[PDB]
Amino acid sequence: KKTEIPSHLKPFVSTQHYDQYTPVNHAVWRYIMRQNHSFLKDVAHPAYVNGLQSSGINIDAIPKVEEMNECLAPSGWGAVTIDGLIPGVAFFDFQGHGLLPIATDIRKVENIEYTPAPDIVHEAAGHAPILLDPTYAKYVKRFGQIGAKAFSTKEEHDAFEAVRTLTIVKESPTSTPDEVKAAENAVIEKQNLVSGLSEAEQISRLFWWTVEYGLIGNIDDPKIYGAGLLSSVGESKHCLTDAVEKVPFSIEACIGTTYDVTKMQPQLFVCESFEELTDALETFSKTMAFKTGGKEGLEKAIRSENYATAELNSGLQITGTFSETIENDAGELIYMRTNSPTALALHNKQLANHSTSVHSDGFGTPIGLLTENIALENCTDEQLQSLGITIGTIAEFTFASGIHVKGTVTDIVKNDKKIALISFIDCTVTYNARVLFDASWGAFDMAVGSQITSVFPGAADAAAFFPMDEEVHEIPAPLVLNELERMYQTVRDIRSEGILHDAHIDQLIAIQEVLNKFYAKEWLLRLEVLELLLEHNKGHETSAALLHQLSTFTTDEAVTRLINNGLALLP
C-alpha cells in the first residue's frame, strides 16, 4: 500500500510533467549520474548504488516521481511533486509522514556543476538513496516530525514571504527589472530584521550538517551520506580532501554553526551512526516548545505573531495567534489569550461548535489549579456537583490565582475522564479590577487546564482550520525541439536500440559534421557519440577524431574538467 498524503499538505502537491524534459535535460541527468556513480560507489555510504535503483532512480534518464512513490512504498515511504518554495514546517511535515518532496525542474547544461536553485538531481538523486537504509529513513522521518513543530519569529515569516514573492516575480515574463529589483530589496530589508536563534534556525543547521552535508564513520576515513554531497561529485571530491576540516558530530556544534549555500562547505561533521543522530535529535527536541510547553513555549508562539496551538493537560488544544499573557508576582502564567479567529480541538480533531466562525475575535483562558489544590481537569462528576458546576446551575468558583468565575453552566466537554471545556452564559470573569469576560460579550467557553503541555506552530486540525484550496495548474504546452535537441534524441534512440548498423553510423557521422560546421561549443553530444562508437567498437575514424577534438576542445577550465571526467569513463 502506498504512503497517504495528509489533507493539510495536499494544497502544496503539484504534478510532474515528463514531456517538459528536453533531450539535453536527459543527457545532463545521465552525465551527472554516470559521474556520481564513478566516484560515489567507493566513497559514499554502501546503500547509494542499490538505493538509487530501489528508489526508482536510474542513471540513463530523469526519474518519474510517481514511479519513485511506488518503489519506496514497501519501505513505508513515498514521493510527491512540489512546485515552488514551500514553508519549512510543510517540507518537514511531508518527511514526518514518510513522503519525499521533490522539485522536478532540472538544471541547464551551463549549470551542470552548480545550480542556484535545488533541482531534481539534488532532490531525488541526493535525498532518496540512503532511505533504503531503514535506520536512515527513521532519522529523516523523525527529523520531519520535529522540524514541523519548530517555531519561527515574525521576522523569519516576513523574510520567507518576501523570498517567495521574488521567485514569482523573477520567473514571470510580465515583470520589469525595476519590479524585480524592488522584490529583491524587500528580501534584504526583511532578512536584515531577522535576529536571534529560533528553533527553526537551529533545526535548519542540524538538517544541513546531517541530511544535506553529513559524513558517517571513522573521522580519518569518512563515508558520504549527505544529499548535497551525493548530488555534487565536485563537492564530494573536495570534501574528502584536507582542505575541509572533519569535525566529530555534536548537537552543540551543528546547531551553532552557520552555513553558506554559495560556497563549498569549510567543515563537515562526522557521525558514528544514524542511531546517534536520532538519539541526539530526540535529546535536542526537549529544548523545544512542543516538549517544554509552559510560558516559555507560549512566548515563542507570541513572538511568531502567527497561528499556533497550545495544548493543556486536559488535552484541550487551542489554535490561534497568541497575543497576551497575565503573570503573577512570581512570573508564573495564570491567564492567556489569542487576538485572532480561534479553533478548539481534542485529539487533533476540531470540536463541534468551536470553529473560527464561533471564536472570530479571540479566545481567553485562565490557567491553573482551583483553590483547595483542586485540579479541575481531574474533577469527578461528584466533585463538580459540590463545586456547583452542573448544567443549568449558576457556578461560582475561584482559581488559586484569584481569577473569579461566575456564570450559568451551559455545556461540559470531557476528554475521556478529564474535563476539557466548560461553557457558560451570563458569565463574569474577573482578576482583581480587570474584567477578563463581560456578560454582554455572550458565551464564555472556559478551556480547563492547570499546565500547558505542548506549544507548536500551526493547527491541531489543520484541514478544519485552514482553507484546503484545490489550486488548478494549467498543463504546460508541448516543447518545440530545435535541430540540436533532435540530434541529442537521435543519439539516444540509437543507443537504446543496442545495434549500430551502417545507416546508424552514417547518421552519427552526419551529426559530427553538423556539430563541426554549426555547433563549435557542443561538447556533451560529442561525448555521447564517442561513448556509443567505443561501446560497439565501430566508427574507428569518427571516434579517434572526436577523442582528439574533445581532449583539446577549449581554454575553459570548467568545460575541460567536465570533458576529461567524461573521457575517463570511456572504454
Interacting residues toward Fe ion by CB under 5 A: 227
* CB nearer Fe ion, residue 85 or residue 463: 85
Residue 341 CB, shortest distance to Fe ion, in Å, is 35
* CB nearer Fe ion, residue 129 or residue 364: 129
Residue 48 CB, shortest distance to Fe ion, in Å, is 16
Residue 212 CB, shortest distance to Fe ion, in Å, is 5
User: Taking CA 239 as the corner, what is the angle to CA 236 and CA 241, rounded to the nearest 5 degrees?
Assistant: 120
* CB nearer Fe ion, residue 51 or residue 566: 51
Is residue 11 within 8 A of residue 462, CB to CB? The reply is: no
**180 sits in which H/E element:** helix 177-193
C-alpha cell of residue 290: 512542543
* CB nearer Fe ion, residue 208 or residue 284: 208
Per 3-state DSSP, the chain is made up of helix, strand and coil in percentages (nearest 5) of 45, 20, 35
Q: Residue 359: name the closest of 414, 301, 318, 326 by CA.
A: 318
Is residue 466 within 8 A of residue 459, CB to CB? The reply is: yes
Residue 122 CB, shortest distance to Fe ion, in Å, is 5
C-alpha 563/C-alpha 402 separation (Å) is 78
Residue 567 CB, shortest distance to Fe ion, in Å, is 30
Residue 211 CB, shortest distance to Fe ion, in Å, is 7
DSSP string, 460-493: TTHHHHS-------PPPPPPP--HHHHHHHHHHH
Residue 16 CB, shortest distance to Fe ion, in Å, is 18
CB burial readout 504-518, b (16+ within 10 A) else e: bbebbeebbeebeee
Q: CA dihedral in degrees (100, 106, 110, 115; nearest 10)?
A: -30
Maximum separation of any 2 CA atoms in the chain, in Å: 102
548 marked ligand binding residue: no
* CB nearer Fe ion, residue 227 or residue 403: 227
The closest residue (CB) to Fe ion is 227
SS (H, E, C) 353-412: CCCCCCECCCCEEECCCECCCECHHHCCHHHHHHHCCCCCCEEEEEECCCCEEEEEEEEE
* CB nearer Fe ion, residue 125 or residue 227: 227
Residue 96 CB, shortest distance to Fe ion, in Å, is 16
Residue 249 CB, shortest distance to Fe ion, in Å, is 18
**CA-based radius of gyration for the chain:** 30
Residue where the block lists cell 502544496: 12
Beta bridge partners of 454: 311
DSSP string, 192-240: HH--S--HHHHHHHHHIIIIIT-EEE-SSSEEE--HHHHT-HHHHHHHT
* CB nearer Fe ion, residue 155 or residue 235: 235
Residue 320 CB, shortest distance to Fe ion, in Å, is 33
| N-terminal to C-terminal alpha carbon distance within the chain | 43
* CB nearer Fe ion, residue 227 or residue 289: 227
127 marked ligand binding residue: yes
* CB nearer Fe ion, residue 121 or residue 301: 121
DSSP secondary structure code for residue 73 in this structure:
G
C-alpha 438/C-alpha 490 separation (Å) is 79
Q: Residue 440: name the closest of 453, 455, 425, 451 by CA.
A: 425
282 marked ligand binding residue: no
* CB nearer Fe ion, residue 227 or residue 446: 227
Q: Which parts are annotated binding residues for Fe(3+)?
A: 122, 127, 212
Q: Which parts are annotated binding residues for Fe cation?
A: 122, 127, 212
Q: Which parts are annotated binding residues?
A: 122, 127, 212
